[PDB]
Structures are given as structure tokens and as C-alpha cells.
Amino acid sequence: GHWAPGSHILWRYRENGGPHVHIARPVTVVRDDADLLAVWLAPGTECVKPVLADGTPVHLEPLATRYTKPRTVQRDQWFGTGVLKLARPGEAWSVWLFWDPGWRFKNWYVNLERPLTRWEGGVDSEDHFLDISVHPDRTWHWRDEDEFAQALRDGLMDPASAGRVRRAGRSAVAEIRAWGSPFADGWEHWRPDPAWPVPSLPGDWDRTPA
Numbered sequence: 001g002h003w004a005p006g007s008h009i010l011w012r013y014r015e016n017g018g019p020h021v022h023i024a025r026p027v028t029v030v031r032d033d034a035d036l037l038a039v040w041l042a043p044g045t046e047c048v049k050p051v052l053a054d055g056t057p058v059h060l061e062p063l064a065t066r067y068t069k070p071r072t073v074q075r076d077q078w079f080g081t082g083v084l085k086l087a088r089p090g091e092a093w094s095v096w097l098f099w100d101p102g103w104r105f106k107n108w109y110v111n112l113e114r115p116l117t118r119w120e121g122g123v124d125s126e127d128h129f130l131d132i133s134v135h136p137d138r139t140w141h142w143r144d145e146d147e148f149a150q151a152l153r154d155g156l157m158d159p160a161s162a163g164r165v166r167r168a169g170r171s172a173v174a175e176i177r178a179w180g181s182p183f184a185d186g187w188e189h190w191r192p193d194p195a196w197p198v199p200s201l202p203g204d205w206d207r208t209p210a
């Protein structure tokens with residue numbers, strides 16, 4: 001069914017090309033219905049993320065080896081300001097909103113990704129490398145095209161799957177140009193309940209969907 005608002009769930013990503021969870025983010029359900037899942041990732045939340053096995057942050061590893069060196073997982077507090085994440089069922093992206101301090105809206109970010117798979121504890125995806133940034137003035141640009149390219153060269157995607165990601169990118173860009181959902185929907189005015197606690201990272205955050 002659908003989770004009640006205020007419910008705590010996990011928003012997760014698998015490792016690239018494998019079954020194990022490498023990102024796990026406890027989030028609070030904002031909305032969950034036939035048209036949309038919306039969740040809030042609060043500052044200070046304990047999350048899991050990948051790191052290189054030698055301790056190098058993934059983003060700090062030179063691009064040539066970023067996707068080839070062995071990885072492990074680390075638990076640590078979410079860095080920086082909170083994120084509201086929105087995803088339509090079946091859609092090969094989610095849209096995340098970020099604000100500067102004092103809730104001054106900054107941008108929407110379209111994260112191209114495998115359509116979320118719902119399971120008992122939350123939703124799982126696989127990241128598709130390419131992102132889009134959208135500004136309040138309705139302009140847009142790609143982000144992480146370099147990572148996308150490298151991931152292709154390293155065989156993390158085959159040309160077919162890469163084609164599908166770019167097709168999704170073009171569909172999201174058509175939505176941005178049309179100023180469709182969720183851009184036009186006023187999520188930038190959304191605020192969390194100040195009563196909501198910060199959700200904990202469950203000890204079994206790594207369990208696979210049955």
C-alpha cells in the first residue's frame with residue numbers, strides 16, 4: 001500500500017553492477033500516493049555511502065580510477081542542508097529540492113536513475129550518473145556528464161543502457177521546458193513539520209528486498 005506521512009523509510013542505491021546496498025538514507029515520508037512519493041532527508045541524519053577501500057572519498061578519486069578501484073561502505077552524518085526528494089512511479093528519475101539557509105530556494109536537481117523499486121523498508125534504485133540542474137528562473141544545465149562518460153568507458157553501462165539514460169534525460173528536459181511537474185508545483189514553498197524527529201539508521205539497513 002502507501003506509507004502514511006511521517007513514516008520512516010530508507011531511500012537506497014545499490015552498488016553499480018551489483019546487488020549490495022552502497023547508499024542508504026533514512027527519510028521521513030512527506031507524501032505517498034499513486035502519482036508521487038515525496039520524502040524528506042533531514043540534516044544530521046545518519047546515512048551510509050560508498051568510499052574507496054583505501055579511505056579516499058569517491059568524489060576525490062581521480063576520474064580515471066573513480067569507478068574501478070575497490071569500494072566499501074561508511075556510516076556518517078549526512079553532509080549539509082536537507083533534501084526533499086520527489087519521484088513519480090515508474091519514472092527513470094527523481095527530482096530533489098535544495099535550499100540555501102533560511103529556506104531560500106536554490107534549485108531542483110533531476111537525478112537520472114533506475115525507477116524506484118518499493119520494498120517493505122523503503123525504495124531502492126541504481127544511479128545513472130548523469131544529472132540535471134534546474135534554476136528558479138527556469139534555466140537548466142547538465143551535471144556530472146564527465147562521470148557519465150567515464151562510467152560508460154569503464155563498462156558500468158553498455159551502449160544500449162547509456163542510450164536509455166540519455167533518452168530519459170531528453171524526456172526530463174522536455175518537462176523542464178514545458179514547466180511541468182514537479183517544477184510548476186510549488187514544492188519550493190514546502191516546509192517540514194518542526195516536530196518531526198530525525199530518523200535513525202536501522203541496524204539492518206543492508207537487507208535486500210525479499
Ligand SMILES: [Mg+2]
Nearest residue numbers: 111127129131
Ligand atoms: Mg545522479
Ligand code: NA
Nearest residue numbers: 087088091093
Ligand atoms: Na520522478
Ligand code: NA
Nearest residue numbers: 183184185186
Ligand atoms: Na513551482
Ligand code: NA
Nearest residue numbers: 182183186187
Ligand atoms: Na517545485
